[PDB]
Design a protein around this ligand. Structure first.
Ligand SMILES: Nc1ncnc2c1ncn2[C@@H]1O[C@H](COP(=O)(O)OP(=O)(O)O)[C@@H](O)[C@H]1O
Ligand SMILES: Nc1ncnc2c1ncn2[C@@H]1O[C@H](COP(=O)(O)OP(=O)(O)O)[C@@H](O)[C@H]1O
Ligand SMILES: Nc1ncnc2c1ncn2[C@@H]1O[C@H](COP(=O)(O)OP(=O)(O)O)[C@@H](O)[C@H]1O
Ligand SMILES: [Mg+2]
Ligand SMILES: [Mg+2]
Ligand SMILES: [Mg+2]
Lengths: 375, 73, 375, 375
């Protein structure tokens, strides 16, 4: 089938499956991490109509399905559904046999270890890969940045990290994990669109709210004067055509969605915000690291494609950090993919080929071997 | 073992060069020589100055920022 | 590699490696005597990142290292680490082969003799120098002064001597050795900056405290009225920008650091102070020497670059010594280097070339030969 | 109100307010040092519901508050919040007027002096006590031990000292201060319980993690064989019922919490550990003191109620100290209160009544008088 030993870089952070080959620019198979299930009976005889719809095919039929993300906040909930996602990933979209290729998974730090361990157990026992590795999402986000020094903000669909790394060495004590991410912003956006007058309650309607969040939101550099501006005039009211008919027109909801990311008191989650978890992750580091963390602050995962979020980020960290510091919020426009791109780089290095957790070494010490080889 | 000293996918010279070209780390020539001193100097017929091993001696007409390969010639 | 037989003058007193060639003005390789070691794991694959950082390169990465001076109070503690310091000294910084050059080491008087003996053993067995000598630090500090008569105060990082020498003859019974030096002043300065409010506990932070000591301290000619002056107004408060951010502002800590050197009861070490070890070293000498020790009191090592320390020194010895004596505290501003400079002079003399402890004479009587040829 | 002139012993080390009268066995008012604040709006009209919850009342409502310790590592951060803690201390829990009673505060050595000075300023200007004193925590921990000679380990919530005292005389040069204490062990325990699978991120959840630390931890006399034992079987897995529902079951996290106290490399804080700060504080003392420091090593503050910590302590110091020494780790089971008990003893002595920093002597020389009367 395949005449190569190219490593597979499979990457489900929490909300969007992206996969491909090692040593490649763009991820080959990008599709949402959903499994579908018909919530009512079928009538037409002779249709096919299996009781599983995974990936973008589920979004073709999302009107008649109960959509269900199998992984939540980076934690895999239903292992059978995630096995459907992986089966559709390798066998249908990417269309390659896992038996002949090493695999490079990704996860979050501060993960429940049964996710990592059972993920390795499914990768070796079911799909029978020859090699396997459990990559950290944020470190790979620093691999695609072309740097070896920087603090990493990625903020995927269910997790954000702010992992500081200095000169090839990470700082595991200064690590962070906040559970405020894009799915919570989608639920809050659904709540405030219910406040305006557009009632979205279905999971398919929740997917439409995610579409409105992706297309039509920005970050509000100064939230107070932007709030008074939205209360002032209708220069911020924007119409978005929903699928099948009625258009919407959003005002202050256009920028109160990512302000929740910068201020978690709107969603009532006790936290300090993104800009203070960065500053706290810098202040937990030592004294002689911090200007290298200021000049190389990376903001290159998902949920950062809101326009001007680097201006709010630099404008706020400048207010937090002491003066005469050069706050460089590195936002390369290739983000939302840079964790896969760092997967492609790290899977294509020459030094990495003796760090593979491989079979006959998996079977030697069982599934706990990941906690002694990987990290 | 000269061919193997150059072409090995984990320990060869060209694998290290493809590594330094592949990853960006603000890479230079002296850092690449540092990598060759790290992983490639465990072989007998490789020869460098900062490593020790291969070779221990402080041989004249062997400068820095260079390395010797004992070829068939 | 080198077309010369120039003798190497390598000089680690206790805290700063300075090395160079014989017959030279400035030492060629000056770098701190530290070895680094990463106190936590590495993450980035393909970095280099060896488990050794020596010299100023360690100060480039001191945020992620546990810094460790291999020599303490002039006594070498870890011989492997000092071998790393010498290997980096000859092979990397000075960049010359030790096989073709005689070497001129330095040490303290009243040394444990395994330091001298094992130092000669490492210099002949490992680096294979043709010749070797174990120079006294203070005598070389009198060679750079251009005199043959004087009492020598140097006060390096871990030791001070006050070696009196009259007309080419030293007085070995009147010799002194006090273990109060600049590293103890660095620890006391760290303690009183903790008293003010700036908490420094890391070895890298200890290096920052050493930087504040070097830049921003003076000697307080009269400590009582200077103490009442610092308690009076804020004309002594001075701000120093730390690396990466927060500035400090020191008051009475600016001059209570070297007063500990003149008064060891602040650090609780039972002694008489520098000014009374000088006067006791003079009073242990005979009667007809002392005005030549008064007119040629040398103060030319490290930890004497505090402004006005010659005024406190002369002002105190004048109070101790009897009247009609001319107390000339010779403080040539080329100090902190004068022990190396005396190494350059003494290594470049014509008479010295039959005082080299050489190979085939080392092998004749073993490593004890230093206790019969050198001193 | 009160017909006595009994001195008040108020003791906030860093994490638990304990207060009472002089000449008493048990502290009368013991409550946690927290201030509460409702992080969201109120709805029910007619409730009371003030915007302040201090002490154990805040732990009655900790689900709806943002808990905030006003003192951190022995350093008071918010003076208004600590004034709320003192106001609730004297006026509500202890229920006595400060105007008629002398007060005996406690603090850490190597404190920023604005804590001591502004603490005296608040005690005289706001509460108007007639007398006041700033007691050292560790010295009072030696008063309750009934001894006059010993080295003191207390290890409160934010600080540990190891203050050596010989025959009524302390050794101020051999003093130590490590910032690794029970709150950092609570954060590390929260991190490794996140590693197991129980995610705690709220400050109230952090309080629950502190409860699990107090109830269900021990010290692991030999950490390597205990680690292999926890990896071997499930004889160490213990279930703890959380408040409101789901039980937990901890394994190797039961003993990796205080091993961080004995090994600060787990939390990445550059230090030597408790057992080497004791041995370094003994080796900084003179030669003829040390067997009296070995026979009277006191371990009588907070965070030492882990079972068998005296066995790990004696078992490690025996490996560090030379042989034929009697390492007596004195652990009286009345600890966590012994700093208050030494406050009760020292406040009830006859000699102490001319060491009170009093009003009309405070007003004579201003707030700096504490740095000339107290220590
Ligand atoms: N252009 C965009 N604007 C705003 N949000 C976006 C945009 N693109 C993606 N997102 C959000 O980012 C999340 C996916 O981020 P990503 O890091 O790819 O997830 P994963 O953790 O699966 O890798 C989705 O919830 C989506 O709503
Ligand atoms: N300009 C300066 N002011 C004050 N102290 C200094 C200055 N320069 C160096 N020192 C101190 O002198 C010490 C080094 O003294 P030196 O005699 O060079 O040591 P060594 O014994 O290695 O020769 C250092 O610890 C440093 O703190
Ligand atoms: N039984 C126990 N087991 C383990 N830890 C405890 C126990 N009791 C108290 N602690 C810890 O000790 C700390 C309080 O120590 P203490 O010295 O009383 O504080 P303070 O500095 O306020 O006096 C608390 O953080 C608590 O977590
Ligand atoms: Mg992602
Ligand atoms: Mg010196
Ligand atoms: Mg306490």
């Amino acid at each position: 089938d395949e005449d190569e030993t190219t490593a597979l870089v499979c990457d489900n952070g929490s909300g969007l499956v992206k996969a491909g080959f090692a040593g490649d620019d763009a991820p080959r198979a990008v599709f949402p991490s959903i499994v579908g299930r018909p919530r009512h009976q079928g009538v037409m005889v002779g249709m096919g109509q299996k009781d599983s719809y995974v990936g973008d095919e589920a979004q073709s039929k999302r009107g008649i399905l109960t959509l269900k993300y199998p992984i939540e906040h980076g934690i895999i909930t239903n292992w059978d559904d995630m096995e459907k996602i992986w089966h559709h990933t390798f066998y249908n979209e990417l269309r390659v046999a896992p038996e002949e290729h090493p695999t490079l998974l990704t996860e979050a730090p501060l993960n429940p270890k049964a996710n990592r361990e059972k993920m390795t157990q499914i990768m070796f026992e079911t799909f029978n890969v020859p090699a396997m590795y459990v990559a950290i999402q944020a470190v790979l986000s620093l691999y695609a940045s072309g740097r070896t020094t920087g603090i990493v903000l990625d903020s995927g669909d269910g997790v954000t990290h702010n992992v500081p790394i200095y000169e090839g060495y990470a700082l595991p004590h200064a690590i962070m994990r906040l559970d405020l991410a894009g799915r919570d912003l989608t639920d809050y956006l659904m709540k405030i669109l219910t406040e305006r007058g557009y009632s979205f309650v279905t999971t398919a309607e929740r997917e439409i709210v995610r579409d409105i969040k992706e297309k039509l939101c920005y970050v509000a550099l100064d939230f107070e004067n932007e709030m008074a501006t939205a209360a002032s005039s209708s220069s911020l009211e924007k119409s978005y055509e929903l699928p099948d008919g009625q258009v919407i027109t959003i005002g202050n909801e256009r920028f109160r969605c990512p302000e929740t990311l910068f201020q978690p008191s709107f969603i009532g989650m006790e936290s300090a915000g993104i800009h203070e978890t960065t500053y706290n992750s810098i202040m937990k580091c030592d004294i002689d690291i911090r200007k290298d963390l200021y000049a190389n602050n990376v903001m290159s995962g998902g949920t950062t494609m809101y326009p001007g979020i680097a201006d709010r980020m630099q404008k706020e960290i400048t207010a937090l950090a002491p003066s005469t510091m050069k706050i460089k919020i590195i936002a390369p426009p290739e983000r939302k993919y840079s964790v896969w791109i760092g997967g492609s780089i790290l899977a294509s290095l020459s030094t990495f080929q003796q760090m593979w957790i491989t079979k006959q070494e998996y079977d030697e010490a069982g599934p706990s071997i990941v906690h002694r080889k990987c990290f | 073992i000269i061919c193997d000293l150059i072409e090995n996918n984990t320990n060869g010279i060209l694998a290290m060069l493809d590594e330094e070209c592949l990853r960006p780390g603000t890479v230079t020539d002296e850092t690449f020589l540092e990598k060759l001193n790290q992983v490639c100097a465990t072989h007998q017929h490789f020869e460098s100055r900062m490593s020790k091993c291969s070779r221990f001696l402080n041989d004249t007409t062997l400068p820095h920022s260079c390395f010797r390969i004992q070829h068939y010639a």
